[PDB]
Amino acid sequence: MNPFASLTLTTLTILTIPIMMSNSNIYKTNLYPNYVKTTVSYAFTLSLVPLLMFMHTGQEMIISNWHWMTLQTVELSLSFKMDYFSVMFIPVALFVTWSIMEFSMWYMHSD
Amino acid sequence: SDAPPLTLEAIKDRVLYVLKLYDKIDPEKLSVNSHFMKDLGLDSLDQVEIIMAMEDEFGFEIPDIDAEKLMCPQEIVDYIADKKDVYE
Amino acid sequence: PDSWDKDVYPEPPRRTPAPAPQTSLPNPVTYLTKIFDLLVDRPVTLAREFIEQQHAKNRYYYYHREFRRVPDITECEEKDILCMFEAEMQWRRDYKVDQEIVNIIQERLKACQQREGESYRQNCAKELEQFTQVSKAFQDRYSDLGAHYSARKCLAKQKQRMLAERKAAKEAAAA
Amino acid sequence: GAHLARRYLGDASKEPDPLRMPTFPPDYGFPERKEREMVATQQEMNDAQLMLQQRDYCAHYLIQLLKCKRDSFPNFLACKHEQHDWDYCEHLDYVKRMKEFERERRLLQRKKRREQREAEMARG
Amino acid sequence: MLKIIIPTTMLLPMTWMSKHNMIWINATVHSLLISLISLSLLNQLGENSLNFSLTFFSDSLSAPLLVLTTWLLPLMLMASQSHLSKETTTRKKLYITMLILLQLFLIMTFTATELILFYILFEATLVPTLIIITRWGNQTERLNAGLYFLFYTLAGSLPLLVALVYIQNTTGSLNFLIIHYWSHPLSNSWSNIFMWLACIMAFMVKMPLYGLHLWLPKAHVEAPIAGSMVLAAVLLKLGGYGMMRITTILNPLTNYMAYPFLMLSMWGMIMTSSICLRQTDLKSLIAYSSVSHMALVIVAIMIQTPWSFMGATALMIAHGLTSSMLFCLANTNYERVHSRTMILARGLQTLLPLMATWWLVASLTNLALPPSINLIGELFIITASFSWSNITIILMGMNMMITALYSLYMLITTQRGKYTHHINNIKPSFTRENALMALHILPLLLLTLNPKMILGPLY
Amino acid sequence: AFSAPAAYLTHQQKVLRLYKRALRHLESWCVHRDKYRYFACLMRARFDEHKNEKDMVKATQLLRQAEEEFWYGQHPQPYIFPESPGGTSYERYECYKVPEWCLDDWHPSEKAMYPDYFAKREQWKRLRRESWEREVKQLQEETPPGGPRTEALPPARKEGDLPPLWWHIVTRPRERPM
Amino acid sequence: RHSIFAVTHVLIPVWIIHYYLKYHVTAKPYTVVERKPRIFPGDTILETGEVIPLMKEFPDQH
Amino acid sequence: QQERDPWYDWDHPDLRLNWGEPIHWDLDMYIRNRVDTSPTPVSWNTMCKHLFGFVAFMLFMFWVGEIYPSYQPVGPKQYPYNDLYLERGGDPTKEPEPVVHYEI
Amino acid sequence: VHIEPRYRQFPQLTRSQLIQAEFFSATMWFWILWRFWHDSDAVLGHFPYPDPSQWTDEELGILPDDE
Amino acid sequence: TLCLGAITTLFTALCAITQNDIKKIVAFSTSSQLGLMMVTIGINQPHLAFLHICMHAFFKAMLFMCSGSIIHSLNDEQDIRKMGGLYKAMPFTTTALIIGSLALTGMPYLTGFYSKDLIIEAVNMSYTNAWALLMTLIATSLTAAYSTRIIFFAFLGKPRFPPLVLINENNPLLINSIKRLLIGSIFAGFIISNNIPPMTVPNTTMPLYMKMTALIVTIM
Amino acid sequence: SFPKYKPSRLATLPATLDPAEYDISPETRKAQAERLAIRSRLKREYLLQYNDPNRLGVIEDPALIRWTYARSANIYPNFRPTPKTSLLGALFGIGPLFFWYYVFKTDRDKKEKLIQEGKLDQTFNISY
Ligand SMILES: CCCCCCCCCCCCCCCCC[C@@H](O)O[C@H](CO[C@H](O)CCCCCCCCCCCCCCC)COP(=O)(O)OCC[N+](C)(C)C
Ligand SMILES: CCCCCCCC/C=C/CCCCCCCC(=O)OC[C@H](COP(=O)(O)OCCN)OC(=O)CCCCCCC/C=C/CCCCCCCC
Ligand SMILES: CCCCCCCCCCCC(=O)SCCNC(=O)CCNC(=O)[C@H](O)C(C)(C)COP(=O)(O)O
């Protein structure tokens, strides 16, 4: 089903799992920073795929997945734009963030 | 890790190191309890220079009101030990 | 899929070119797509087949409610409270229906804009014209009523507009 | 640029105005001028959805470049000849525009000097 | 809707016959059950109201207010039993009786079909509030506050009654349905102007309008915690409900009679937001924030457009919840250090981390961080005002800045910095206070999930 | 920070403070060490040139003119030590400072861990409670009838006495607590 | 134990997301919209099988 | 409060206040999270003159450069199909006036 | 990897860090030189810039100052 | 937009050339680069601005990371006046900062070249405000100015830090992070540029002297 | 000799540049002695309670109470209607109101007049 949309949505979805796990017996151990870094790295490697799809076929999409509310003549829905800008910017930010978290693991060790 | 656990002996050695490196102070005569004015024959400007030398050595500033009071290397060792929470 | 009517929400025939590899090197996208298919799409489809099989075993229906037409506000006496009540409720239902019509046309326009890509200014003219017409009619009907709107206010607005257009036509005829 | 220095400091009357160009009819000095042709049809440009600015007279080379880039996708160094062809067409278009501006300059100066000389001859 | 009214009337003797050490438990349990039952009023129609009988009815505007009142009562019960521990049994039962009577009056107020019964109940709410403030307040100023609370209201509401009965003699009815279906325009005369003013000034003073707000800091600062909670969360919204009801018979006079009130509201939200920046009292800051938000609501109602009405309803609900939470948060610190000065106890994030989290969440919700319903109401009002006149975006924009400033200011001064050295009686937060904060905050985000329930009948 | 201040600064204290400030700001201007040594020796000679002025009025006038010269030629961005009041890490570790009395409110389960520490803490509390009254009485006797005239405090003089007002000086949290 | 991270943090969310998108979101009109793919001269359409002609006898400025 | 001596042992170090001393009427505006009146190396109203002069010069020069723009010695870009009449907004039932370009 | 304070000496350096630093500098310079050798026109320009003065009047089409 | 970007970039670059805190210099460089992006937005090249954002992220983040390594090593000291000779004391950090400063200054065929060179050449070839053009050129020179300021005062000369030397950059996490960002700052410009469709019309015809103008002002 | 520094409200005069400090008198020294005596007496009073082992709660500071009471409750009793007070009150409380009223009334009058002639471009203005 054109994995473009599912992959690009899962890329953003998988970043929220550590926030959910922040109340388990992993936020209280010393393995949490590495867990967050691994999550970000996995998200970057997954987001690398829609970028290849866009480079190949110029593929673009919008996903209006949830209808939040509808005013009288204005409809508000949870919608995402997956154009050139989004698919090109997301992996760059993810790469920079991964490198910065790995750096912070050492810089902020005594905090 | 971070810097080692600074001790009193290290502080005393560093203070004596800085003081013996001074051309106006002779090393053999200098002791840990020597008085800058009385035993060593210096003036207040020299004491200010000594305090700045210790500030540069240890990397933290001593306030003037506290710096003027220090008169012997033992006093300086005690002050630096108190400032950096040194007990061993 | 058949869930919605294709005439209320039309689409062009969806032309897509055939692949023409001009390079010896293997296309990564096709390999990753095959992997995603076999690993993600297959498991989901089987689960949906199970859930659909379970649903078909217990099938029941619900109905769309039909409303008759009652006398309008114009056929309403000045103080006949029951007739005014029925006419008012009918007017509110019609207002909601008109809002949904405008929403459908807006959805058409948005879909056209996203679909046409770089050629939307020229390729989306029909939807823009449809929205212009429907918005003009809706704005004439319902705008400026304000809160506390009612069927009587709409009738007064309409009568004012008809008086104005009658005077304009009569004056134009005299030229 | 020196043209800015000439227009802003020298005589602006004989310097072309970029917003208002050309002033003279296109066939003024030319006896006959060939009409500039196109290669890419409107439908082809629309289907390729190039852009509203890339639909210039060099659009066909751009369509060829886009085709080759799509076909030879993973080998992103294979699109060299067509890129150069598109660049050459754009360069030729810029040279044509430079010729147009310079023709405007020479024609304006020539006409102004000729009119001044005619006025001088009629003034004596 | 006697299925909701009768259980509160039965809360009364249950409280008065409970054992001396089980009053709080029974009251909390049965108030929570009544709130659960009242949650069923949200099943509303899209055309008309739910006309249960000739006396009571519910719209999409009153149902969230009723749910808010029912949910608020147990919160005040939980927040009250801390400082009433040394009180005697009879006085505690009297306090709970006051709260129950206030809830009953508000519930019957929000659903009366006739304007004169609405008037009777909306004045009847004054007595328990005055008794609570003047009896269970802490400082000597409470007495004066009570007076400022009373006459300011009554001087506004006594003319309204006159107008009301006058209307009954000309139209023959005060039933809201008949009034709506038989509405007629108001001519441009002095008599109509003064009728408009009489019908409007009571609800203006209840909001309150800028220039008519001096009673609010006094009442909200000198009251006990439950009194402040119910004053800010529910009683301020009576003015909004009444104005959105009564404006159906005042057109087209409002088209020009809203000008002084619109000017007062905008410049007064600016002025009160600026006032909040220099406030040595922590409760007064919350009172003035309430004033600013209610000024926004007044502007929304005076504009008289559907988007403005929806924004007004959403802002009313959101502000009620947020202001109640802020008052409870300040009351915890007051119960610890016995002082309201904002710069007395500092660096409390070091000593009370979870309470610091609650403070941060409440402050973020106050300054209308999206997608909180505070932001939805504020944005709907701003959009309607921009449609009204393009220059309003200046003043509203100004407010959107100043609010945030003082919001963060409060936080930064109470939680950040270094702790006061000489204060050493700061005990860890109790389970009661943490549960209070959680029960304040979670419904806000749950409403963010489904915000159509609080957008009013214009949805 | 550790010493009790006096009513005023005398002439020599002001001259020494100007000397230190001028040397620091010249170091800020003279980045490199050899150049700083050159100009610092020059500044020291300039300072001690008038070291033997017996006219106090002219000494104060010279001090004034020197201060105006300093304020004109001071560095807009002088070097500050990281933990100094203008430093980048001045109050960085204050949020990690927790008072000791907080340990009084730990749950008994929390106190079950670290038993020996809490035994020593009980020891220290008993010592403070046993010394408080003696400290108070000593302070009363030593202090002048017209109230104290400085912030300086007296030491212990008796057999097992402790210097009065010591609990919050001795039991400081730390410089690097966490 | 070795590679269980990629199953519980990538595979399961992507299964849920694909199920939701392909069976709930795409059940309504205009919820997932893709811009029309680029068509160029000389391309063959998959559905109809048609071909698009070439481009007007290039001038060959070689 | 930023002007107070930081090397003194204040009762409230963050506020730089002592227990019992009179408090300024405007302390909350001077809490050193806020308005600072400390002396500057450059005198006030000399900083103002330079900042205002810089801003005024920048505005005037931007205006002047706007009335003296910079451009290349080239003519307008030429667009094939009647200045792209149809693509820039359709209107296919009006027959726009022809826009013709010639070789050079 | 254990490195200890030196007190007025040059710090201890492990061979690995110097190897990595030299390697990365070398690859940066090799990349720059290779890209210049193969992609020179990106810096020096590709197409010759004309000079309008050397354009004859015949191709340009203006009259010899008479008509 | 063009005027705002031009004044922003010039003013921030002029402010950065005399700062003593390394973090402040880097922050002012980011502000100047944002002004440059606003400039290129003002002359109708949004895709160039996006490409510049993508290219700038890499080397800016890595420059900040090198600064952080320097700060942590020298006992949390940020003033450049107390950093001496770290060219030999810090091999990897020095190499990374050199590559980052060269990429920031538009060294040809690095990641900064593929956006900054095009931006400058497109500003020169446009019907634009002349003052904004002049300020953009002066700002791109001041960029090199503050870059060499950082290099000169941080790495060259004799030590000026306290005598207890705790310099140690041999930690795997820091090395791997800076190495990844280094690979990015070296190759990402080429890799990304050759992989996107052509969304602009190139300037294939330029006067020879105006082609190297950014290079000339950078060298100056 | 060098350019002079002139102070202002928001950038005051340095202590080392103050001529009042460079001409002293025995009266000045006595005044400084009294100031230290007051400060030391207050510090001793604070430190006596601060170090008390049996003290639990808040050390009440009368200066803070005085500041708060002066800022809040003491303002009206010490207020008098003067020409300055009345003029400032009228200006700061009335001028903004009528200024904004004129602005908004003019804007709405212009908009309504434009609406009446039929030229405001209200196309697609469905929601209000
Ligand atoms: C501190 C905040 C508390 C709340 C304040 C509430 C504000 C209430 C203000 C009432 C708003 C309007 C009241 C009257 C409507 C118009 C006012 C008048 O200025 O308009 C002109 C009126 O003209 C003149 O102004 C006559 C009125 C002059 C005398 C009124 C007293 C105003 C002095 C200010 C007193 C302040 C009142 C508030 C005291 C606290 C209109 O001209 P005209 O066409 O002819 O009259 C229209 C009515 N017709 C059609 C029947 C003829
Ligand atoms: C454009 C709409 C709004 C226009 C701006 C109106 C002016 C707003 C004035 C707000 C007043 C705020 C009062 C209370 C704030 C809290 C006090 C406070 O923050 O203290 C100041 C605090 C301390 O100073 P530091 O320098 O950080 O000292 C650190 C070392 N000690 O610093 C600040 O926060 C200063 C903030 C004030 C900025 C106000 C000036 C802004 C002017 C903007 C005009 C430019 C518009 C640009 C248009 C762009 C073109 C499209
Ligand atoms: C960076 C640019 C700013 C720098 C500019 C600064 C310029 C200032 C230079 C001029 C300053 C002077 O010479 S002003 C010289 C003032 N001279 C006197 O006061 C003579 C009386 N002597 C004493 O007071 C003591 O002996 C004393 C000297 C204190 C020694 O004390 P000790 O022996 O007990 O340590």
Short mmCIF file of N, CA, C and O in Angstrom, two decimals, chain E residues 110-163:
data_model
loop_
_atom_site.label_atom_id
_atom_site.label_comp_id
_atom_site.label_asym_id
_atom_site.label_seq_id
_atom_site.Cartn_x
_atom_site.Cartn_y
_atom_site.Cartn_z
N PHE E 110 -28.67 27.09 36.42
CA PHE E 110 -28.23 26.89 35.05
C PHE E 110 -29.28 26.27 34.15
O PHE E 110 -29.03 26.13 32.95
N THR E 111 -30.45 25.89 34.68
CA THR E 111 -31.43 25.17 33.89
C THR E 111 -32.86 25.69 34.04
O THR E 111 -33.79 25.01 33.60
N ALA E 112 -33.06 26.86 34.63
CA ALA E 112 -34.40 27.42 34.74
C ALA E 112 -34.88 27.90 33.37
O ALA E 112 -34.15 28.59 32.66
N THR E 113 -36.11 27.54 33.01
CA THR E 113 -36.66 27.93 31.72
C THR E 113 -37.11 29.39 31.69
O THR E 113 -37.21 29.97 30.60
N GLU E 114 -37.39 29.99 32.84
CA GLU E 114 -37.91 31.34 32.90
C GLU E 114 -36.89 32.28 33.53
O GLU E 114 -36.17 31.90 34.46
N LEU E 115 -36.83 33.50 33.00
CA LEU E 115 -35.81 34.45 33.42
C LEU E 115 -35.97 34.89 34.87
O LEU E 115 -34.97 35.24 35.51
N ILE E 116 -37.18 34.87 35.41
CA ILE E 116 -37.37 35.35 36.78
C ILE E 116 -36.97 34.28 37.79
O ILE E 116 -36.42 34.59 38.85
N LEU E 117 -37.20 33.00 37.48
CA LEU E 117 -36.67 31.94 38.33
C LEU E 117 -35.15 31.90 38.26
O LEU E 117 -34.48 31.67 39.28
N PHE E 118 -34.60 32.12 37.07
CA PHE E 118 -33.16 32.25 36.93
C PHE E 118 -32.64 33.39 37.79
O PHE E 118 -31.61 33.24 38.47
N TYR E 119 -33.35 34.53 37.81
CA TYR E 119 -32.96 35.64 38.67
C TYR E 119 -32.99 35.24 40.14
O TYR E 119 -32.06 35.54 40.89
N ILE E 120 -34.06 34.56 40.56
CA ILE E 120 -34.19 34.20 41.97
C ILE E 120 -33.04 33.31 42.40
O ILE E 120 -32.42 33.54 43.45
N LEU E 121 -32.70 32.31 41.59
CA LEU E 121 -31.63 31.39 41.99
C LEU E 121 -30.25 32.04 41.88
O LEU E 121 -29.36 31.78 42.70
N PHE E 122 -30.07 32.92 40.89
CA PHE E 122 -28.79 33.57 40.67
C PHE E 122 -28.54 34.67 41.70
O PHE E 122 -27.38 35.07 41.88
N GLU E 123 -29.57 35.15 42.40
CA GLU E 123 -29.34 35.90 43.63
C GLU E 123 -29.22 35.00 44.85
O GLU E 123 -28.49 35.33 45.78
N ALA E 124 -29.95 33.88 44.88
CA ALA E 124 -29.87 32.96 46.01
C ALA E 124 -28.47 32.40 46.20
O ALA E 124 -28.12 32.02 47.33
N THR E 125 -27.67 32.35 45.14
CA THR E 125 -26.29 31.90 45.29
C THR E 125 -25.45 32.85 46.14
O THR E 125 -24.33 32.48 46.53
N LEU E 126 -25.94 34.06 46.43
CA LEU E 126 -25.13 35.04 47.16
C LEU E 126 -24.97 34.68 48.63
O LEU E 126 -23.94 34.96 49.24
N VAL E 127 -26.01 34.08 49.23
CA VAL E 127 -26.00 33.88 50.68
C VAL E 127 -24.94 32.88 51.14
O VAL E 127 -24.15 33.23 52.04
N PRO E 128 -24.86 31.66 50.59
CA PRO E 128 -23.80 30.75 51.06
C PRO E 128 -22.40 31.29 50.83
O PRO E 128 -21.52 31.07 51.67
N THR E 129 -22.18 32.01 49.73
CA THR E 129 -20.86 32.56 49.45
C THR E 129 -20.47 33.59 50.50
O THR E 129 -19.34 33.58 51.02
N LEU E 130 -21.39 34.50 50.82
CA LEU E 130 -21.11 35.51 51.84
C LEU E 130 -20.87 34.86 53.19
O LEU E 130 -19.94 35.26 53.92
N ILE E 131 -21.68 33.87 53.56
CA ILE E 131 -21.49 33.20 54.84
C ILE E 131 -20.11 32.54 54.89
O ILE E 131 -19.37 32.70 55.87
N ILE E 132 -19.75 31.83 53.83
CA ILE E 132 -18.46 31.14 53.79
C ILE E 132 -17.32 32.14 53.94
O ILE E 132 -16.44 31.97 54.79
N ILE E 133 -17.34 33.21 53.13
CA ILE E 133 -16.23 34.16 53.14
C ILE E 133 -16.11 34.83 54.51
O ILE E 133 -15.03 34.89 55.10
N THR E 134 -17.23 35.33 55.03
CA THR E 134 -17.17 36.14 56.24
C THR E 134 -17.02 35.31 57.51
O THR E 134 -16.60 35.86 58.54
N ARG E 135 -17.33 34.02 57.48
CA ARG E 135 -17.20 33.18 58.65
C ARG E 135 -15.89 32.40 58.69
O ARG E 135 -15.23 32.36 59.73
N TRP E 136 -15.49 31.78 57.58
CA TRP E 136 -14.33 30.91 57.58
C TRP E 136 -13.11 31.53 56.91
O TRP E 136 -12.13 30.82 56.64
N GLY E 137 -13.13 32.83 56.64
CA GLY E 137 -11.94 33.52 56.20
C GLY E 137 -10.94 33.65 57.34
O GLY E 137 -11.25 33.43 58.51
N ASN E 138 -9.71 34.02 56.99
CA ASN E 138 -8.62 33.99 57.96
C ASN E 138 -8.28 35.36 58.54
O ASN E 138 -8.07 35.47 59.75
N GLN E 139 -8.19 36.40 57.72
CA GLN E 139 -7.76 37.71 58.17
C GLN E 139 -8.95 38.61 58.47
O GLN E 139 -10.10 38.28 58.17
N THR E 140 -8.65 39.76 59.07
CA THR E 140 -9.69 40.72 59.43
C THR E 140 -10.36 41.36 58.23
O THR E 140 -11.50 41.81 58.34
N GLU E 141 -9.68 41.43 57.08
CA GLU E 141 -10.22 42.10 55.91
C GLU E 141 -11.44 41.39 55.33
O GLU E 141 -12.21 42.02 54.61
N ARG E 142 -11.64 40.11 55.66
CA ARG E 142 -12.72 39.33 55.07
C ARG E 142 -14.06 40.04 55.19
O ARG E 142 -14.81 40.11 54.21
N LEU E 143 -14.36 40.62 56.36
CA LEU E 143 -15.62 41.32 56.54
C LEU E 143 -15.82 42.37 55.45
O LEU E 143 -16.82 42.34 54.72
N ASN E 144 -14.83 43.25 55.26
CA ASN E 144 -14.96 44.26 54.22
C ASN E 144 -15.13 43.61 52.86
O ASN E 144 -16.00 44.02 52.08
N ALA E 145 -14.36 42.56 52.59
CA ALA E 145 -14.50 41.86 51.32
C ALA E 145 -15.93 41.42 51.11
O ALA E 145 -16.51 41.66 50.04
N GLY E 146 -16.55 40.85 52.14
CA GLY E 146 -17.93 40.41 52.01
C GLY E 146 -18.83 41.54 51.57
O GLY E 146 -19.61 41.39 50.62
N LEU E 147 -18.68 42.71 52.19
CA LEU E 147 -19.50 43.85 51.81
C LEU E 147 -19.26 44.20 50.35
O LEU E 147 -20.21 44.37 49.58
N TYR E 148 -17.99 44.26 49.94
CA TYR E 148 -17.69 44.58 48.55
C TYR E 148 -18.27 43.53 47.62
O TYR E 148 -18.67 43.84 46.49
N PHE E 149 -18.34 42.28 48.08
CA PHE E 149 -18.92 41.24 47.24
C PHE E 149 -20.42 41.42 47.12
O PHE E 149 -21.01 41.14 46.07
N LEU E 150 -21.06 41.89 48.19
CA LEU E 150 -22.52 41.88 48.23
C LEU E 150 -23.10 43.01 47.39
O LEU E 150 -23.73 42.77 46.35
N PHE E 151 -22.86 44.25 47.80
CA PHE E 151 -23.54 45.39 47.20
C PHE E 151 -23.14 45.60 45.75
O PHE E 151 -24.01 45.90 44.92
N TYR E 152 -21.86 45.40 45.42
CA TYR E 152 -21.44 45.45 44.03
C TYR E 152 -22.34 44.58 43.16
O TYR E 152 -22.74 44.97 42.06
N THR E 153 -22.67 43.38 43.65
CA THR E 153 -23.58 42.52 42.90
C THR E 153 -24.99 43.08 42.92
O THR E 153 -25.63 43.22 41.87
N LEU E 154 -25.48 43.45 44.10
CA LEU E 154 -26.89 43.81 44.23
C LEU E 154 -27.20 45.11 43.51
O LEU E 154 -28.23 45.22 42.83
N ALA E 155 -26.30 46.09 43.61
CA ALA E 155 -26.49 47.33 42.87
C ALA E 155 -26.56 47.09 41.38
O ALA E 155 -27.11 47.93 40.65
N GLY E 156 -26.03 45.97 40.90
CA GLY E 156 -26.15 45.64 39.49
C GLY E 156 -27.42 44.88 39.18
O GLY E 156 -27.98 45.01 38.09
N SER E 157 -27.90 44.08 40.14
CA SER E 157 -28.96 43.13 39.82
C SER E 157 -30.35 43.66 40.12
O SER E 157 -31.33 43.16 39.55
N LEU E 158 -30.47 44.64 41.00
CA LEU E 158 -31.78 45.18 41.34
C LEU E 158 -32.45 45.86 40.14
O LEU E 158 -33.66 45.65 39.94
N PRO E 159 -31.76 46.68 39.34
CA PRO E 159 -32.39 47.17 38.11
C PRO E 159 -32.85 46.07 37.18
O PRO E 159 -33.95 46.17 36.62
N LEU E 160 -32.06 45.00 37.03
CA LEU E 160 -32.42 43.92 36.12
C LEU E 160 -33.81 43.39 36.42
O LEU E 160 -34.66 43.31 35.53
N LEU E 161 -34.06 43.07 37.70
CA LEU E 161 -35.37 42.58 38.10
C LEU E 161 -36.47 43.50 37.59
O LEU E 161 -37.43 43.05 36.94
N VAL E 162 -36.32 44.81 37.81
CA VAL E 162 -37.31 45.76 37.32
C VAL E 162 -37.55 45.54 35.83
O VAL E 162 -38.66 45.21 35.40
N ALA E 163 -36.47 45.63 35.04
CA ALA E 163 -36.61 45.42 33.60
C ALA E 163 -37.32 44.12 33.32
O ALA E 163 -38.29 44.08 32.54
#
